[model samples]
Target: MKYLPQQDPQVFAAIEQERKRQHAKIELIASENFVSRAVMEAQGSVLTNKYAEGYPGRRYAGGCEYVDIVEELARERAKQLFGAEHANVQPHSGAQANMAVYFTVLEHGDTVLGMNLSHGGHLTHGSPVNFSGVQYNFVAYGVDPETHVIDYDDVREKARLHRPKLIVAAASAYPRIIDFAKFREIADEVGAYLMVDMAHIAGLVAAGLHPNPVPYAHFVTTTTHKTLRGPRGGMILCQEQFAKQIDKAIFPGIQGGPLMHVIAAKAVAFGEALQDDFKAYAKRVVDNAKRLASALQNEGFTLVSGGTDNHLLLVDLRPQQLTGKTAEKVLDEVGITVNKNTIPYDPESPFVTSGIRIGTAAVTTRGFGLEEMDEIAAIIGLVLKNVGSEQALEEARQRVAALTD
Candidate 1:
């Protein structure tokens, strides 16, 4: 909004066009969301100029008086929201937060247990390509084939057999509510520390729509940007005992100087999450997702895990004779943006997955509710049904333009 990039018209034009596209389309990416104006303002604030390389009151820089307050406020708000004893708000992203958690507990090549990568687990949760997989010895757990849900008995058996030092019960595209207490039981039985990655449902947890994992697990990690609706950053929550290593791991082990501006924005969002209105919004997010998932199912699409328990739904596209890439392309043509994803235990690869992940966060941000979700589902169904028909695509496109406008 300040300086015009006249010299770099190509880059600026592309960004402007991309913003316009985002404005004109429906966003259903499960891991993405829209942050509020206050959050964005804080992210662009003067706090970015500071280089607070350490935690509050233990900084390596000269001027951190203000940002220190912001960081601690974020910590307190996070602890309150999740009902945790202590919190660390320094990790630059959810992956880093998880890395810090790993560093806090285990040494290199130490035996660990994480969810399987293609079965709703994230890359940082110990996929071989990531740093987590390379440094630590990881045993992977997956969902049941018939039920398409996590099997607690199987998890327990695996935990007992692997005898891991740390056990993580988390998912990236899991559709149902996880039994955190059950996972805790298994972790305890195996003498392993437990971490819950609530990156996808932090807002719902704060809104009391989902079971809070803080009390049941040893640590909780989440991305502040997703359902939490903050700046693009991350945080780690744990009992008071692990606070020191968590903080130190984030500061020196994972990241350098903390992103003070984003931390300030996280603080602002955490404060917002404490407000009643934000709770209302968070509830609405899950409500919108549920309605959308049901509508899609009624229109003959296969909604994964029967339906969603939080803010997203995974559509199993095999019945439609379409891959996730095709679904994503077709939806984009009709101005309904969604991301390609793999169904739990799918034989397909990531490039052309057997599922598509849809979320309600951005739609909810645009003041959408049940009525809008129904219309969205109808449009998506119509577009997919007439994929090869030009007349049908145009009709759907016109409808999308009207809704977006």
Candidate 2:
């Protein structure tokens, strides 16, 4: 920072302002969180200067001795945290992790089954605009209209009809516990490989708050951030049988050199996840989510799946005749940040969806608990209900300032 401040003051000032912004606002974005100082230190370490081109003991570069240790520790800690037979910590992000999985097994035009994007799946989970959808045939399965939860029967029906080579069990905004065992059964029935993109719930799985997908799926992928509370990175966990193919796919097949410093930070984060305190933190996250969900419900806002069983809630804004875009704007105006999300069977377009996604991970990390969650929810209700009222917004802004203070 000393050199950075002296060398490029403009960028330095922007970074400092970003720090202030985060400290001053409530972060309700489902996919974001704050990493610990330990994770930050490793990410900003000297390892960034190295060029580690491959796995431990088998690198294409000359000076990989220390970087190899960093990568190996990352791989080992990740495997231990998820109880997987093998792990690859080289993928640059969650998208790259899934891309590597595709490279390992899928051929062009091969069929795959995944959750529908509007129904809670990620863009990489076979959105038509993403590489996964364009390269391979991606058949989508969505929630039941009545219950607003994953229609397991519909998923099985799709697998049987498409006869896909792979069936992916993953969702970015699903609020309930996933049944990976059922997904495994469906995959076995269709003679397909099972891959789970668990980027959103990796921390919950690590802390035993959710079911572990590693034991059931042939491959599992996750980001190091989100509820995992790590630096921005990606990881892949698989059985020993697919270890070689997965590693080869990530290295010579796609990316060249790995980010050694980020890998070091991932190792530190995974080590932290393996602790008793992390489990307690995970529990508090879920607890806070439930409290917020109930509070929002009492304010007449309907939640997807009725309520959340995890750290996030997808709120349907249609009851109050509000668009997700409007809700997001009003919430942001008052310093409570959240993203517009698509609810299942949403009639509106992606850019103007009917729902908003919120989470408690960041707030919990900031030491806010149930009382804070209730207050946050009440503030959201106030802003959204009085979007055009300057007096209400001013009052809501004052409330936000008080909570953040």
Candidate 3:
């Protein structure tokens, strides 16, 4: 990057600005995390110059030997990490990995059941605007409105009624532990294939802090980043019966010429996850989330589902007479970053959501702990309570600056 100034000052300047921003702010985005220097180097390595158009030893192009080793290492490590029968480290993102699974299992217009987007599901999980919804007969399921947790009975009823060919168990804003065993039961009762998109909890799953989905779901998909703390990419893990189909869906179906550099980076990240310290790191992330959630509740802020069992929390800001947009803006102004999200049965529009989702993954990677979360909660309360006041925001800014420094 230092040489970038001599080669291309414009792009270099932007990168430097982003670097400074990351160092200056407290990142709380649930889907975001900082990668280690090793992962970054692997991503920026010379592997980017090659085109490994197919699986290792099955490539359409030449000079794939080294890249093959990288891919093989990534695949095996991922399988071992998640107890998967096979792994594909090719999809460019969590969404693409999901698309591959859908392609593998369902024909167009096949009945599919997934969590509702506004209630914590990802866009690819049958959102009307996404391809999954357009191609499949999607039936939406959501949380229990009273508890803000997954209503397993509702899921079972929906599975019985819809009799969907595939059922997806996943969420983007959900804060509780997903019951994959129960989801599998529903899938079995209806003879539907189960796919668990465990992107948000991959790190915890790796650490055994959360239930592993590999044994229950026919397919599991995740992003390499997020809590996995890997490169920005996607991975699919599944039983051996579907390995060939999964690989085909990713290559000839969705993408061409896998990102070898990113795969190399993913391999590096997987190696890091295999270490003892990463397990400890995963534990700390969950602990910080719990501490932060409790502190916020103590400050009189309402936490959706009453708290989190994992790395993220959804906060309903309606009681404070504020919108998610306003809370997000004011928090950003004070250098605390979080994403506005929708609560179950939220009356507000998507843009003006009634809630915000915060996570400890990124901060935990930055070495934040329960003590830091305690202060973060106080700062969040101070800013939200004094919304629209520049003086209060300025004071909060000073406090944030002190912490970051």
Candidate 4:
């Protein structure tokens, strides 16, 4: 910041404003988290000047000795954390990690089964607009309308009917533990390879709060930033037998040069995850989520699936006669940031959903506990219930300011 202030004052001013905004707002987005200072320092290190075009010790370029060590540490730490036989820490983002996996095993127009987008699946899991759906034939399985949990029966039925070459598990907005063993069983019954996008719950799995997908999946992809509390990047884990192909798919098939600085940051974050404190942090994330969900429910907001078993929950706004868009706008006004999201069987359009997605990761990282979660839920209730009242909105803003301060 000292250098930036004089060198590029315009850009520095914008960056300063963003820093203030982050400090002032309550970040409830499920996919976002604040990285540690060590992680940030690693990203800002001198490694960014290098281009290590391939995996560790097998690079296409010279002078990669130090970056090679960093990447090796990242891969080893990731494998140790997840108990996977092999780990690729070079992927630039989660979507690219998924693309590399698909590129490794799938042919053009091959049939694949994945969770439905509206039912809590990610865009790369086979949305029509994504490359995965554009190149391959993707079939979808949905959750039960009444329970709002994934319907294993539907997954089996779809896999059997489509006879797909791959079956994908995991979701972006689901609030329960995914049954990876069941997904593996269904894939095995249909002779399909199983891939799990555990981008949202990697930290929980690492902390042993959720079941690990490494034992049941042929391939697992995740974003390092979400609950992993790292730099914005991605990673892939698989068996040792498929390691070569996975590496090639990422380096030659999908992407060219790897981001060395981000890989170093990922290594730092992975090291943090290996510590006992991170397990406690992950526990608080889940605990705070449960507290927030219960508090919100007590405020008369209907939560999807009744509650959560993880760091996120969806608030169904239909009962309150409010759209997700309105709630998001009003809450943003009060300095509480959350995203409007589609619930299972949503009656509204995706742009104006019937629900909002909330998470405890960022707040938990900020050291908020059960009592703070209750206040957050109450603030959200006050903001939403009196969107037309300036007095209530001002009071909610004051509460939000107090929490952040």
Model 4 local distance difference test score: 0.94
Cα lDDT tens digits, model 2, 1-405, are: 689999999999999999999999999998889999999999899998988887899988888888888888998988888899999999999999999999998999999999999999989988788899999999999898967889999999999999999999978999998889999999999999999999999999999999999999999999999999999989999999999999999989889888889999999999999999999999999999999999999888999999998889999998899999989888888899999999999999999999999999999998998898889989888898888899999999999999888
The top-ranked prediction according to lDDT is 4
| Cα shift from native, residue 164, model 2 (Å) | 0.4
Local accuracy of candidate 1 as per-residue lDDT tens digits, 319-367: 8788899989888887888889989878799888998999898879888
Worst lDDT run of 10 residues, candidate 1, spans: 1-10
Q: Let me know the TM-score candidate 4 reaches against the reference structure.
A: 0.99
Pairwise lDDT winner, candidates 3 and 4:
4
Residues 93-117, candidate 4, lDDT per residue (tens digit)? 9999999999999999999999999
Misplaced by over 4 Å in model 2 are: none
Which ranges in model 3 have alpha carbons more than 4 Å from their true place?
none
The C-alpha lDDT values of all candidates are 0.88, 0.92, 0.93, 0.94
Q: What's the candidate order when arranged by decreasing lDDT?
A: 4, 3, 2, 1
lDDT of 3 by residue, 146-196 (tens): 798999999999999989999999899999999999999999999999999
Question: Could you tell me which residue pairs clash in candidate 4?
Answer: none
Off by over 4 Å in 1: 5-11
Task: Please report how far candidate 2 places residue 155 from its true position, in Å.
Answer: 0.7
